[PDB]
Every structure is written in structure tokens, then in C-alpha cells.
């Protein structure tokens, strides 16, 4: 593949120093190259087959192919002896909601500012260039040594670059084509679908301000529902919050999809107008 | 690949025995087979290599995964010396456009009838199942013997069934979701580009009545601009057909995508309430 080392053992580059997580997909490994010393998050990923290879690869292309500041970097990635290794910049700071398990707090409205501000620029370049996060929340946002965040995660995500590509690709007059075709206004090209992380983001913010999400406290079988029938979240405690903040969450926060607002148009509201990380410096360093 | 045979040689099993067509992928071919005398049409595409097998995948497997009266069913698939063998049931009465050509003539209203009722039936079927056509035209509706027709050329279509089948999979509890996620209103599912096979019905109709599609006298250069800056067509001497007709035409050539009829729609129009190919028939005959 493409980005995908053959033959050779990520053991002979990256040495395992310990663990950084557990999830569904197996261990993630704190990794330092041999020859570099430079840190990454390793992800080893058992496969039954080759054939598994192909649902890895969205993410392995993405984390390929992004270059922004605020997304992770694919630093290596092996197939061998039947696992899939990916080597993933490390940000020192772990995730977002680890620290407010660790400080057990949430985070104060100027750290949410900075999260928000980077979030967004790191989502508009996602959305601009035709991905989808599709998995935005407090555990896949981290924090570098910096004070600044990095977005990881692109497990579920979607790069609509190809399709575009594939579905503009025609031959001979198009006499037939619908105008909407013409016009370039297809479902690929449109907010609509790159919207829904919009949601997340503003999910990620309550989760941010309370530690845990929205309906935390349901049976896991009910939040599907819950979020169906349900007006949008608030924030629990609004006393405690910015009229910029509580603002910003509902031009997030709202179910009519056309009136929710883009990355684009977020980005110039006077929630995300801030250039300092300095709060976020004062939070890693009381977690250091 | 699933479909497609490899290390046999396609003229073991088929024999040519002249030219159908001829167009941007080469030479379509007249094929029976040498056991049991089936007719077939030959497509034979020349390939550079293998990594172009995947650009015809899609196409074969909506023939072979589809099974519906009005739609072409998949023969056989062969990679042979560099070329994709693709052989399609035949249709011995060619594409409606050659038809046209041949009698130099345009169809009668209650011909039109029949294609489009018949047409229709296929394309809700693609519908239901996530596939759209995307190259709806005179020249890819076939005639059989019997008077009916079969919908032909998935070249360019899309079948949205497995990314629909990837991006309902999550795991854990997906606090952060969208509400148009969770009640499974994203792109995939929702009508609107679907509807763009329902313009392009519209388009093929003005064809049958008028032998050639609106705006075949103008530069090519200029139709994509002339689709996007004009009104929807209409027929170009209204006298000649019924208020059916217009109507049915007008529910199609909508340029709202949201106000244009979904195909479910249009079966209950009583411009399709029709179950007699006997117009068409009297149609082949003359041809035969
Ligand atoms: N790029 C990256 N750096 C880190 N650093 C990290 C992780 C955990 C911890 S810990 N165990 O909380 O102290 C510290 C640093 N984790 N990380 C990634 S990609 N982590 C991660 C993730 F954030 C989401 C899914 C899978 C993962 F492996
Ligand atoms: N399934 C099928 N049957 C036929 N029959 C046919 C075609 C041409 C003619 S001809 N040359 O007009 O008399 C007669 C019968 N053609 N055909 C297909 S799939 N034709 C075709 C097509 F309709 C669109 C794109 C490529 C193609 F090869
Ligand atoms: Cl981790
Ligand atoms: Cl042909």
C-alpha cells in the first residue's frame, strides 16, 4: 500500500517504551525511534488477513495526506506478522478528557476557548478538504507539551476527495446532466454531510464545561433516542458561562441542519477570537 | 475478484460473431455462447494494467448483484491477455436511440408510455437499493424481442450500499452524534442525489418525442451553461402531446431538487398507469 511498510519489524525502528491506552482495537504503545529518539503513539492492530488491510486505509491516507498543525502526523506504518502498525505523532499532553479525570474538573471557559479555536481551524481544513471526523469528542482532541491541541482519530472517518473526482469524470456532451450536477451542488460538495461535526464539536464543549457528555447518566441504550426526541443540550449550569459561549453552542447545537452553522462561519464568531494558549499552558502544567 | 474470471480464455466460451457497437471503451461485440447458444453483448476494454480492474468493479457488481426484469443481467466477466471480457444478456432490439435513427423518426406518445413505465419500475428498483444510474439516456435503454425494455450501462454509476453498511458502524456510546445521523437522515439515505436519475428520465422522454435531447444544436461547449442558465426544457411543439405527458415531464424537469418527484412519486402518475407493450411491438416490428 500506498503509505504501508512491507517485510520489515517496527521493532527494528520504534522501541515500545510502555502503554498509552486500551481500546476496541487493541493497545496503544508509547514508541520512541531508535535512531531519532522521537516519540510517537503506537497503534498495533491485529488482522485475521490482507484483505482486513483495506478498512485501515481511509485513516492511514488521511493522516497521510493532512498537513495542519493542529492534526496529527502519520510518522511510519507496518504490516507485520499479522498486525498493522501505525506510528502517530505523540502529544505529551494526552487527551482532553483524561486530564479532567486526572485533575477531576472540567476545563475553565478560557481553556475551552483555546480547544474550540484550534478544534475548528484543524476541522475547517478537514471539511475544505472534502473529510468528514465523524468521531469528534473531548477523548480524540490531545494536547501537545506546547499548551496547544492536536485532532486524532480518523478510524471512522470520511475522504470524499476520490468520489468528487470519480463522479465529476464524464465523456461526450452531457445533454441529461440534472442542473444541481451542472451547478457542482451534489451531496458531496454541500455542508450538509460535513455539518455533523459541527454537533460533535458542540457535544465536545459541554464535555469540556461539565467533564461528561450530555445524557451520561442513561442507560447506554437510550441516548440514541433521547438525542432524537430531545431539544439540543444546554449547558447544566449556564450562570457559569459566557453569553459568547452559550451563543456559540447554538449555532452548533441545532437540529435544522441548513441552519447550523460551517466551520467556515464559526470561525468569525467572538467565542474562537483568541491567539494565546497561555490557559491551556496553566492546565498541562498542573497535570505536569 | 468476486465477479470476474481469471486465467480462462473468454473465446473457449463465447463466440463472436460480429459488431454491435463502438464507442470510448472500444468495441461492444455480438457473443453466443458455444454450449448453450445464449446471445450476448461482448464488451471487450482494453486494460494497461491491473490496478484499472478496480475502476469497472462497481459496474459489475451492480449487474451481477441486481435482479430486476427491466435491468441487464451479468453473463460472465473475464481478465484475459489485458482485456476485461464484460458479457451482458442481449437485447435484440438495440438501444432506443438507434431505433430513431433507423425508422428516422421519433417515438408515439403511447411508446414513450411504455419506456418510461418500464424505465421507471428499473430505476425505483436502483433506488431502493442505493444504486444511482448517473447516465440515463435513449442510447442505454435496450429493446428485447418481446417488446420490452432492459436498462443498460452502469459505466459511471454509484451503489452507496457498503459505505451506507460502514458509516451506521459504531461502537460504544455515541454521546456526540448528530441528530440527522441518528435518524438516518445523512446523504446515503436521503433522496437528493437519487434525483438526479429523475431529471435525466425527463431529458431521455424529450428525446423519444424529439429524436435528439434539448439542446443538441447548440456548440457542446456551451450546454452545461445552457442547463444551469435556462428554465427546465419543454416539448418544442406542445400541441402533439397529451397533459400527462407535460405533467409527468414538469414533475421531473424541476430544477427544486426537493420539489422534483421521487420515482416512488412518479408511479403514481397516470402518464405511467400503463401494462401493455403492444406500442412497442408494433415499434420492433417495423424495424424487424
Ligand atoms: N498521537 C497520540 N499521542 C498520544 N499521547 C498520549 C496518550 C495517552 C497518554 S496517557 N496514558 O493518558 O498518559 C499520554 C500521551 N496519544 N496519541 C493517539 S493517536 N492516541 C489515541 C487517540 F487519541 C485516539 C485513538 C487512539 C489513540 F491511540
Ligand atoms: N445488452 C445489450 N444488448 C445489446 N444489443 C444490441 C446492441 C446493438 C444493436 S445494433 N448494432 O444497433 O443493431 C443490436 C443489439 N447491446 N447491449 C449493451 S449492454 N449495449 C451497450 C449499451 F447499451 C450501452 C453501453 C455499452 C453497450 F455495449
Ligand atoms: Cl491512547
Ligand atoms: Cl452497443
Redesign the interface.
Known amino acids: 500500500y500506498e503509505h504501508v511498510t512491507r517485510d520489515l519489524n517496527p521493532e527494528d525502528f520504534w522501541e515500545i517504551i510502555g502503554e498509552l491506552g486500551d481500546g476496541?482495537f487493541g493497545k496503544v504503545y508509547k514508541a520512541q525511534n531508535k535512531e531519532t529518539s522521537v516519540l510517537a503513539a503506537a497503534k498495533v492492530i491485529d488482522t485475521k488477513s490482507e484483505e482486513e488491510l483495506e478498512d485501515y486505509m481511509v485513516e492511514i491516507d488521511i493522516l497521510a495526506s493532512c498537513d495542519h498543525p493542529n492534526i496529527v502526523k502519520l510518522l511510519d506504518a507496518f504490516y507485520y506478522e499479522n498486525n498493522l502498525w501505525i506510528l502517530i505523532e505523540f502529544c505529551a499532553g494526552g487527551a482532553v478528557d483524561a486530564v479532567m479525570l486526572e485533575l477531576e474538573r472540567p476545563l475553565t471557559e478560557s481553556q475551552i476557548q483555546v480547544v474550540c479555536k484550534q478544534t475548528l481551524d484543524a476541522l475547517n481544513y478537514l471539511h475544505d478538504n472534502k473529510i468528514i471526523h465523524?468521531?469528534?469528542?473531548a477523548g480524540n482532541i490531545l494536547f501537545t507539551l506546547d499548551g496547544d491541541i492536536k485532532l486524532a482519530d480518523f478510524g471512522?472517518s470520511?475522504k470524499n476527495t476520490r468520489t468528487i473526482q470519480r463522479?465529476d469524470?464524464?465523456?461526450?456532451?452531457?445533454?441529461?446532466?440534472?442542473?444541481?450536477?451542472?451547478?457542482c451542488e451534489?451531496?458531496k460538495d454541500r455542508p450538509?454531510?460535513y455539518?455533523?461535526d459541527?454537533?460533535?464539536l458542540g457535544?465536545?464543549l459541554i464535555?469540556m464545561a461539565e467533564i461528561e457528555?450530555?445524557?451520561?447518566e442513561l442507560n447506554?441504550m437510550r441516548?440514541?433516542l433521547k438525542?432524537?426526541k430531545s431539544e439540543p443540550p444546554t449547558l447544566a449550569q449556564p450562570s457559569r458561562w459566557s453569553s459568547n459561549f452559550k451563543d456559540f453552542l447554538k449555532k452548533c447545537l441545532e437540529?435544522n441542519?441548513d441552519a447550523r452553522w460551517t466551520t467556515s462561519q464559526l470561525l468569525q464568531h467572538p467565542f474562537v477570537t483568541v491567539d494565546s494558549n497561555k490557559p491551556i499552558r496553566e492546565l498541562i502544567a498542573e497535570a505536569k
Open positions: 476496541a465523524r468521531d469528534l469528542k471512522v470520511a463522479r469524470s464524464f465523456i461526450g456532451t452531457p445533454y441529461w446532466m440534472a442542473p444541481e450536477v451542472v451547478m451534489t451531496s450538509y454531510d455539518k455533523a459541527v454537533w460533535s457535544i465536545t464535555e457528555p450530555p445524557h451520561h447506554p441516548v440514541l438525542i432524537a437540529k441542519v
